Design a protein around this motif. Structure first.
Motif, PDB file in Angstrom:
ATOM      1  N   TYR A  49       0.698  -1.328   0.012  1.00 23.15           N
ATOM      2  CA  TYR A  49      -0.042  -0.116  -0.007  1.00 23.15           C
ATOM      3  C   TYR A  49       0.803   1.324  -0.090  1.00 23.15           C
ATOM      4  CZ  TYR A  49      -3.966  -2.956   1.211  1.00 23.15           C
ATOM      5  OH  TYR A  49      -5.052  -3.885   1.355  1.00 23.15           O
ATOM      6  N   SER A  50       2.286   1.223   0.203  1.00 22.13           N
ATOM      7  CA  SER A  50       2.874   2.251   0.270  1.00 22.13           C
ATOM      8  C   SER A  50       3.571   2.958  -1.246  1.00 22.13           C
ATOM      9  CB  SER A  50       4.235   1.958   1.036  1.00 22.13           C
ATOM     10  OG  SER A  50       5.080   1.246   0.742  1.00 22.13           O
ATOM     11  N   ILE A  51       3.141   2.204  -2.270  1.00 25.26           N
ATOM     12  CA  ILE A  51       3.391   2.558  -3.567  1.00 25.26           C
ATOM     13  C   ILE A  51       3.191   3.911  -3.752  1.00 25.26           C
ATOM     14  CG2 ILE A  51       3.334   0.276  -4.532  1.00 25.26           C
ATOM     15  CD1 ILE A  51       0.410   1.248  -5.693  1.00 25.26           C
ATOM     16  N   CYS A  65       6.346  -1.368  -8.961  1.00 28.06           N
ATOM     17  CA  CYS A  65       5.873  -1.736  -7.765  1.00 28.06           C
ATOM     18  C   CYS A  65       4.057  -1.454  -7.655  1.00 28.06           C
ATOM     19  CB  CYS A  65       6.404  -0.880  -6.643  1.00 28.06           C
ATOM     20  SG  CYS A  65       5.966   0.903  -6.517  1.00 28.06           S
ATOM     21  N   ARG A  66       3.738  -0.411  -8.535  1.00 28.43           N
ATOM     22  CA  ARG A  66       2.318  -0.083  -8.644  1.00 28.43           C
ATOM     23  C   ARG A  66       1.561  -1.196  -9.326  1.00 28.43           C
ATOM     24  NH1 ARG A  66       1.821   5.962  -8.531  1.00 28.43           N
ATOM     25  NH2 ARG A  66       3.959   7.040  -8.638  1.00 28.43           N
ATOM     26  N   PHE A  80       1.878  -7.866 -19.563  1.00 28.29           N
ATOM     27  CA  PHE A  80       1.702  -7.245 -21.087  1.00 28.29           C
ATOM     28  C   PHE A  80       0.206  -7.024 -21.313  1.00 28.29           C
ATOM     29  CE2 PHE A  80       5.902  -8.774 -21.231  1.00 28.29           C
ATOM     30  CZ  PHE A  80       6.487  -7.706 -21.785  1.00 28.29           C
ATOM     31  N   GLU A  81      -0.622  -7.685 -20.849  1.00 22.91           N
ATOM     32  CA  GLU A  81      -2.105  -7.588 -21.292  1.00 22.91           C
ATOM     33  C   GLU A  81      -3.215  -7.415 -20.076  1.00 22.91           C
ATOM     34  OE1 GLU A  81      -2.033 -11.641 -23.087  1.00 22.91           O
ATOM     35  OE2 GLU A  81      -3.790 -12.074 -21.779  1.00 22.91           O
ATOM     36  N   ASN A  82      -2.797  -7.532 -18.943  1.00 18.56           N
ATOM     37  CA  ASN A  82      -3.652  -7.514 -17.617  1.00 18.56           C
ATOM     38  C   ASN A  82      -4.051  -5.702 -17.595  1.00 18.56           C
ATOM     39  OD1 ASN A  82      -4.957  -7.041 -15.137  1.00 18.56           O
ATOM     40  ND2 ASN A  82      -3.467  -8.951 -14.494  1.00 18.56           N
ATOM     41  N   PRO A  83      -5.363  -5.641 -17.521  1.00 15.51           N
ATOM     42  CA  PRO A  83      -5.827  -4.175 -17.641  1.00 15.51           C
ATOM     43  C   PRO A  83      -5.302  -3.449 -16.411  1.00 15.51           C
ATOM     44  CG  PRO A  83      -7.707  -5.716 -17.626  1.00 15.51           C
ATOM     45  CD  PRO A  83      -6.576  -6.445 -17.876  1.00 15.51           C
ATOM     46  N   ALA A  84      -5.058  -4.371 -15.294  1.00 14.55           N
ATOM     47  CA  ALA A  84      -4.911  -3.766 -13.919  1.00 14.55           C
ATOM     48  C   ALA A  84      -3.572  -2.896 -13.937  1.00 14.55           C
ATOM     49  CB  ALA A  84      -4.795  -4.720 -12.921  1.00 14.55           C
ATOM     50  N   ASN A  85      -2.758  -3.058 -15.082  1.00 13.78           N
ATOM     51  CA  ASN A  85      -1.535  -2.424 -15.375  1.00 13.78           C
ATOM     52  C   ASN A  85      -1.817  -1.127 -15.459  1.00 13.78           C
ATOM     53  OD1 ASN A  85       0.870  -1.390 -16.491  1.00 13.78           O
ATOM     54  ND2 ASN A  85       1.460  -3.551 -17.256  1.00 13.78           N
ATOM     55  N   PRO A  86      -2.357  -0.684 -16.587  1.00 15.09           N
ATOM     56  CA  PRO A  86      -2.682   0.508 -16.957  1.00 15.09           C
ATOM     57  C   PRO A  86      -3.694   1.367 -16.026  1.00 15.09           C
ATOM     58  CG  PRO A  86      -3.510  -0.547 -18.846  1.00 15.09           C
ATOM     59  CD  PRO A  86      -2.609  -1.361 -17.904  1.00 15.09           C
ATOM     60  N   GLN A  87      -4.358   0.533 -15.572  1.00 13.91           N
ATOM     61  CA  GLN A  87      -5.620   1.089 -14.308  1.00 13.91           C
ATOM     62  C   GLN A  87      -4.879   1.761 -13.307  1.00 13.91           C
ATOM     63  OE1 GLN A  87      -8.443   1.202 -15.600  1.00 13.91           O
ATOM     64  NE2 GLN A  87      -9.111   2.568 -13.664  1.00 13.91           N
ATOM     65  N   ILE A  88      -3.913   1.034 -12.789  1.00 12.75           N
ATOM     66  CA  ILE A  88      -3.257   1.571 -11.776  1.00 12.75           C
ATOM     67  C   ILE A  88      -2.642   3.144 -12.028  1.00 12.75           C
ATOM     68  CG2 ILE A  88      -0.828   0.448 -11.784  1.00 12.75           C
ATOM     69  CD1 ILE A  88      -2.943   1.447  -8.546  1.00 12.75           C
ATOM     70  N   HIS A  89      -2.030   3.182 -13.033  1.00 14.51           N
ATOM     71  CA  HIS A  89      -1.255   4.249 -13.536  1.00 14.51           C
ATOM     72  C   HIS A  89      -2.337   5.552 -13.692  1.00 14.51           C
ATOM     73  CE1 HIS A  89       2.728   2.697 -13.795  1.00 14.51           C
ATOM     74  NE2 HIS A  89       2.254   1.804 -14.521  1.00 14.51           N
TER      75      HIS A  89
END
Lengths: 4, 310, 310, 4
Positions: free
Chosen positions: C8-10, C42-43, C143-152
């Motif tokens: 949670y400290s990201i 880390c995000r 490379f395809e998990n939407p949770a990647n761009p979503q956290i950004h």
């Protein structure tokens, strides 16, 4: 130990 | 919120609750590895330079000189690069190639001293360089410069107060120069008025604070907890604000740092392990059951702490 | 402000203005090395695990599996340790001893694959492990998990908006999975409504985004800018929000990272050098004179970037 | 270069  | 240079981005480090240490979550760690240069020293490196600028001892053109190639030297190197100062650091020729490449990569004029003379040689050489042109060189003296505990009283301490909504009851910190525990304790006890328990941590192998306060013969000794246990009482350690002193051995400090990595996913240095080991011991005493214990983790480790490392 | 665990400290990384790059201070860098695990990953490591928990794909007892031993694997390892999940990472036996010790130190069950098969071997082995008990293993697919761009889109982007008081005009980011540039651009352009210029950066040695958009034959190639230039267009790179693509060579990316260290006191990785090199090129064009350019520095380096390293 |  002064190489802090 | 755009910092003019990297020296201004110090601090505002996070507090994380430990799950596998303490009793019912009473141990919280402050991660100083989440800083420029990866350690708590970024704060004092920044403030000693800033204070020298404000008081006129450091001007455009004068150069910084020191004999530390440890976290403070790395911190001074980053600040010097960030603010435009030349800096020379002396160090035994036996220091690692990695540490040498890091300091050179930061723009440091590295002066290697005779391996056989160790830190005594490097310190004597730094003093020699300053003596050669006292008006050109400035040695900031981390063990006695008040700007060291002052930055902790102005930032680190208030951050703990703020992030715990004033609920912090105990602060545990390993002592190297003593600046961290001194500044944090002055902030919380004097500026915020809370009578917390301040706990200094030192190696059982060189328990000079414990020996001193007990009136025993001072007997420093070798140990592996890098960053703490300097073998003497620094002027920046305010013994008057210390309520308790806990000793921790090198092996346990190492095992504790490894557990922080594998069980909490926190990458900290051996001295962080020492501080948590001391905090965990207090946290499991009934008297500290309902108390919030904040532990300073002085530095991060980018590597697993192998035996070769320790 | 006490985080329940280290995942949670990201974020909440700092923006620092560059003094030796850009024109009149128009280049500001976002230091993602100031994160747990020392990189932007880390995000996504945190959010891919959190999203898998929320959607039920990751439950207590199932284990994480992946074939990355790069920044994402390190990030997943820390999050797994911090949240109590078992994790297995496959990797070519030729990876460094240091990287192996780091992952093992984080609690990872490391599976070494045949050196001669490289990343193809490790990826195939990870797929093999999941296939053996699909109900037990979860591969998060960066490379395809939407949770990647979503956290950004939920953190990195808003942080840029906030810290620049909405004045950001250009965002420059190297593309690996594409999550950073995608999420940040969606946040600023769609959520905050500012029509900024989004610039993707890739190696001139493997300019697949440039080739693709130009309708040229796609020809990936080897390069040394670790972290970017995957040699294909990932599903997490939203080409529709990219306004410009800048190419940078490995030598220049390396020289730029070294300058960040020696001239700005900023310790960043080779890909950070690539991003700044691209940003500096745009920052010195008259058209970008009055524009605020924010550059993502994906990771920190704890070492000088030697030739051996590059 | 997939070892990201």
């Amino acid at each position: 130990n002064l190489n802090i | 919120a755009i910092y003019a240079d990297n020296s201004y981005s110090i601090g505002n480090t996070p507090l994380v609750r430990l799950k596998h240490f303490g009793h019912n979550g009473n141990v919280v760690v402050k991660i100083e590895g989440r800083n420029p240069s990866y350690s708590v020293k970024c704060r004092i490196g920044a403030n000693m330079v800033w204070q020298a600028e404000k008081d006129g001892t450091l001007t455009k053109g004068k150069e910084i000189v020191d004999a530390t190639s440890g976290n403070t030297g790395i911190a001074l190197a980053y600040v010097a690069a960030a603010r435009g100062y030349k800096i020379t650091l002396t160090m035994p020729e036996t220091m690692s190639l990695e540490r040498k490449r890091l300091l050179c990569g930061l723009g440091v004029n590295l002066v290697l001293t005779e391996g056989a003379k160790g830190m005594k040689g490097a310190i004597a050489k730094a003093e020699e360089i300053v003596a050669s042109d006292p008006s050109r060189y400035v040695m900031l003296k981390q063990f006695e410069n008040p700007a060291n505990p002052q930055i902790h009283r102005e930032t680190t301490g208030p951050e703990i107060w703020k992030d715990t909504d004033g609920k912090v009851d105990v602060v545990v910190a390993g002592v190297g120069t003593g600046g961290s525990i001194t500044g944090i304790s002055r902030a919380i006890k004097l500026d915020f008025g809370k009578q917390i328990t301040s706990v200094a941590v030192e190696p059982v192998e060189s328990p000079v604070i414990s020996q001193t306060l007990a009136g025993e013969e001072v007997k420093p000794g070798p140990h592996k907890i890098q960053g703490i246990g300097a073998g003497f009482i620094p002027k920046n350690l305010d013994l008057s604000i210390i309520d308790r002193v806990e000793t921790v051995d090198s092996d346990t400090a190492l095992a504790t740092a490894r557990r922080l990595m594998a069980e909490e996913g926190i990458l900290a240095g051996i001295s962080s392990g020492a501080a948590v080991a001391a905090a965990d011991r207090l946290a499991k005493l009934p008297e500290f059951a309902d108390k919030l214990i904040v532990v300073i983790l002085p530095s991060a480790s980018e590597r697993y702490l192998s035996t070769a490392l320790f």
